[PDB]
Scaffold this active site. Structure first.
Site, PDB file in Angstrom:
ATOM      1  N   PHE A  17      -8.253  -4.451  35.272  1.00 33.20           N
ATOM      2  CA  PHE A  17      -7.089  -3.929  35.984  1.00 33.20           C
ATOM      3  C   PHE A  17      -7.439  -3.363  37.368  1.00 33.20           C
ATOM      4  O   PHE A  17      -6.599  -3.373  38.274  1.00 33.20           O
ATOM      5  CB  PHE A  17      -6.367  -2.873  35.144  1.00 33.20           C
ATOM      6  CG  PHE A  17      -7.241  -1.723  34.726  1.00 33.20           C
ATOM      7  CD1 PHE A  17      -7.500  -0.669  35.607  1.00 33.20           C
ATOM      8  CD2 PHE A  17      -7.795  -1.682  33.445  1.00 33.20           C
ATOM      9  CE1 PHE A  17      -8.301   0.398  35.219  1.00 33.20           C
ATOM     10  CE2 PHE A  17      -8.603  -0.617  33.046  1.00 33.20           C
ATOM     11  CZ  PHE A  17      -8.851   0.430  33.935  1.00 33.20           C
ATOM     12  N   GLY A  18      -8.679  -2.886  37.522  1.00 33.68           N
ATOM     13  CA  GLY A  18      -9.123  -2.260  38.757  1.00 33.68           C
ATOM     14  C   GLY A  18      -9.669  -0.864  38.514  1.00 33.68           C
ATOM     15  O   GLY A  18     -10.406  -0.650  37.549  1.00 33.68           O
ATOM     16  N   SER A  19      -9.306   0.087  39.378  1.00 35.62           N
ATOM     17  CA  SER A  19      -9.840   1.453  39.296  1.00 35.62           C
ATOM     18  C   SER A  19      -8.703   2.461  39.430  1.00 35.62           C
ATOM     19  O   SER A  19      -7.857   2.331  40.314  1.00 35.62           O
ATOM     20  CB  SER A  19     -10.899   1.696  40.386  1.00 35.62           C
ATOM     21  OG  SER A  19     -12.004   0.800  40.277  1.00 35.62           O
ATOM     22  N   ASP A 135       0.616  -7.564  27.398  1.00 37.23           N
ATOM     23  CA  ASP A 135      -0.639  -6.922  27.012  1.00 37.23           C
ATOM     24  C   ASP A 135      -0.368  -5.591  26.282  1.00 37.23           C
ATOM     25  O   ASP A 135      -1.043  -4.575  26.485  1.00 37.23           O
ATOM     26  CB  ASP A 135      -1.536  -6.740  28.241  1.00 37.23           C
ATOM     27  CG  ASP A 135      -2.992  -6.382  27.875  1.00 37.23           C
ATOM     28  OD1 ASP A 135      -3.441  -6.678  26.736  1.00 37.23           O
ATOM     29  OD2 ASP A 135      -3.682  -5.791  28.737  1.00 37.23           O
TER      30      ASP A 135
HETATM   31  C1  LIG Z   1      -3.592   8.356  32.877  1.00 38.07           C
HETATM   32  C2  LIG Z   1      -2.453   7.697  33.631  1.00 38.07           C
HETATM   33  N1  LIG Z   1      -1.380   8.331  34.032  1.00 38.07           N
HETATM   34  N2  LIG Z   1      -0.507   7.439  34.679  1.00 38.07           N
HETATM   35  C3  LIG Z   1      -1.084   6.192  34.653  1.00 38.07           C
HETATM   36  C4  LIG Z   1      -0.683   4.946  35.120  1.00 38.07           C
HETATM   37  N3  LIG Z   1      -1.437   3.885  34.949  1.00 38.07           N
HETATM   38  C5  LIG Z   1      -2.617   3.943  34.338  1.00 38.07           C
HETATM   39  C6  LIG Z   1      -3.350   2.659  34.216  1.00 38.07           C
HETATM   40  C7  LIG Z   1      -4.431   2.513  33.333  1.00 38.07           C
HETATM   41  C8  LIG Z   1      -5.054   1.269  33.265  1.00 38.07           C
HETATM   42  C9  LIG Z   1      -4.591   0.233  34.066  1.00 38.07           C
HETATM   43  N4  LIG Z   1      -3.558   0.400  34.883  1.00 38.07           N
HETATM   44  C10 LIG Z   1      -2.934   1.561  34.982  1.00 38.07           C
HETATM   45  C11 LIG Z   1      -3.117   5.151  33.834  1.00 38.07           C
HETATM   46  C12 LIG Z   1      -2.335   6.320  33.992  1.00 38.07           C
END
Ligand SMILES: Cc1[nH]nc2cnc(-c3cccnc3)cc12
Length: 273
Positions: A17-19, A135
Site C-alpha cells: 500500500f505504501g507508507s 481486499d
Molecule cells: C491507523 C489509521 N488511521 N487512519 C488510517 C487510514 N488508513 C490507514 C491505512 C493503512 C494501510 C494502508 N492504507 C491505509 C491507516 C489508518
C-alpha cells in the site's frame, strides 16, 4: 503546502500500500493519518470529475466519503513529483482487527456478531456508492476502541463497482474465491461475500480457514474452535464453491445468527472497556 499544515509523527505501517504516518492537523490538532504512495508503484489510475489523472484509490475514497462513519474518510490529498499524499482521518485510541484478534484470540460470538454486522454495513455503503473494496480482511478494518465502531481502510486494490466480470485481482490471495484461483475471473459482490466468509471464520476461530490454493478450491470448512451451528452454517453459506450459491447481503443480515446485534457503544462498554 502540506509540510506546514500537519505535524508528522511516527510511522504506523508500510507495505504494498505504501507508507502511513501518524500526524496532527496543525489548525485544530485533529488526529490524522498520512499515506504516501509512489507514482511508479501505481497500477490503477482514475479520472476526477474535473478530469484529472489520479490514483484510483483517491477516486474511490472521494466517492465513499461523507456522513457514514463505517469507512475511513479522506480529508485531503496532494500530488508530489514522484508520489501522492493522502490525509485520512484517524481514530484515537485505535487498533486494527488483525492485532485485536492476535491479542484477544478467537472472539465471543456476541462480539463477532457486532463487528461483522458493522463491516457488512460499511461494505454495503461502498457498494451503494459504486465502489468495490476487493481486499476486505482484518488488517483493513480499524476499531475505534472508545466508541466501539469499525472502519474500513485501504482502498488501494479497489475498483468501480460493475456487473460484468473482473479479470484482474490484487488483494490478498488467501481471501480470494475459488473462481479467481481457477479461472482468473470473478463478479464483485459474490467475491466480496466469499471474503466476508473468510473474515467471519477468522473472527470466531482466531485464524484463516484456508492456506493453499487447493484448500481454497476444495472449499471444505473444518472448525478448530467451538462455534455455534448457526454461525457455522452462515460461514459455510458465504463460502459456497459456486458463486451463485452464496447469500446476498440481505440474506446474510437476515440470517438467524445475525439477530439482535449489540449497538457499537454497548459493544465497547461490554467487550472493550
Ligand atoms: C491507523 C489509521 N488511521 N487512519 C488510517 C487510514 N488508513 C490507514 C491505512 C493503512 C494501510 C494502508 N492504507 C491505509 C491507516 C489508518
Amino acid at each position: 503546502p502540506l509540510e506546514s499544515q500537519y505535524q508528522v509523527g511516527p510511522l504506523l505501517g508500510s507495505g504494498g500500500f505504501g507508507s502511513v504516518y501518524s500526524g496532527i492537523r496543525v489548525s485544530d490538532n485533529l488526529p490524522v493519518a498520512i499515506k504516501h504512495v509512489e507514482k511508479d508503484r501505481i497500477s490503477d489510475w482514475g479520472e476526477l470529475p474535473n478530469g484529472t489523472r489520479v490514483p484510483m484509490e483517491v477516486v474511490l475514497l472521494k466517492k465513499v466519503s461523507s456522513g457514514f462513519s463505517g469507512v475511513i474518510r479522506l480529508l485531503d490529498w496532494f500530488e508530489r513529483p514522484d508520489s501522492f499524499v493522502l490525509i485520512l482521518e484517524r481514530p484515537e485510541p485505535v487498533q486494527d482487527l488483525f492485532d485485536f484478534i492476535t491479542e484477544r484470540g478467537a472472539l465471543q460470538e456476541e462480539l463477532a456478531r457486532s463487528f461483522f454486522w458493522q463491516v457488512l454495513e460499511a461494505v454495503r455503503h461502498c457498494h451503494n456508492c459504486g465502489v468495490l473494496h476487493r481486499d476486505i480482511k482484518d488488517e483493513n478494518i480499524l476499531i475505534d476502541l472508545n466508541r466501539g465502531e469499525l472502519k474500513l481502510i485501504d482502498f488501494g486494490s479497489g475498483a468501480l463497482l460493475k456487473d460484468t466480470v473482473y479479470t484482474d485481482f490484487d488483494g490478498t490471495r488467501v481471501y480470494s474465491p475459488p473462481e479467481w484461483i481457477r479461472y482468473h475471473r470473478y463478479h464483485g459482490r459474490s467475491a466480496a461475500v466469499w471474503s466476508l466468509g473468510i473474515l467471519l471464520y477468522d473472527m470466531v476461530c482466531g485464524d484463516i480457514p484456508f492456506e493453499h490454493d487447493e484448500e481454497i478450491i476444495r472449499g471444505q470448512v473444518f472448525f478448530r474452535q467451538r462455534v455455534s451451528s448457526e454461525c457455522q452454517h452462515l460461514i459455510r453459506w458465504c463460502l459456497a464453491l459456486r458463486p451463485s450459491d452464496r447469500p446476498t447481503f440481505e440474506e446474510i443480515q437476515n440470517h438467524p445468527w445475525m439477530q439482535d446485534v449489540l449497538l457499537p457503544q454497548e459493544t465497547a462498554e461490554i467487550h472493550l472497556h
